[PDB]
Amino acid sequence: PARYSEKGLGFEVRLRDLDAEPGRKEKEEMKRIEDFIVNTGKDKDVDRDSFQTFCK
DNA sequence: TACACTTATCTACACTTATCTACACTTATCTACACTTATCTACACTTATCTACACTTATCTACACTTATCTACACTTATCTACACTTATCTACACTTATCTACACTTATCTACACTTATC
């Protein structure tokens, strides 16, 4: 995720419209979806592929 | 420069104060858990936006009449050439003043020599 990467390089989950401002729950849902992608799943599990392994 | 006396700088040594480590108690920070409010989705009603259709006004074309623009023609005035007379410009010639060279006298500049003061 770019969110945690100070150089901004990575991926992000975003609202579609550039003009919208995200609601209080939407900002958290977007962070959850990012985390889900990183973990490739709901829970953390070292036995599962990371997103890096998936992409490779 | 050379020489002597005393003061300032530097080293060595002992005592107490400041800095640092180790140990115990309570407060601040963090996690876990339950309740209620704010955010979001789904659904129904009326208002605003958009399309289609008819009527009259503004825009555009076509046509005739007179005014302004343009050409052609004649008369006098301004511009240009040619010609004669006197004034300004230029050359040639003589006289005196300013510039330049040569010559003598005294003053300023430079060298040499002795005594004391500053520097060492």
A19 CA vs B67 C1’ separation (Å):
68
A18 CA vs B51 C1’ separation (Å):
33
Q: How far apart are the C-alpha atoms of A56 and A34, rounded to whole Å? A: 18
Which residues of A spanning 1-56 put their CB closer than 7 angstroms to strand B?
22-26
Of A46, A56, A12, nearest to A3 (Cα)? A12
Count each helix (H run) and each strand (E run) in chain A, helices first.
2, 0
Tell me the two tokens of residue A20: 């919208």
Of A36, A9, A33, nearest to A22 (Cα)? A33
Q: Residue A20: what residue type?
A: A
User: Tokens 């490739």 appear where?
Assistant: A40
Experimental resolution (Å): 3.1
User: Tokens 């989950």 appear where?
Assistant: A13
A15 CA vs B111 C1’ separation (Å):
109
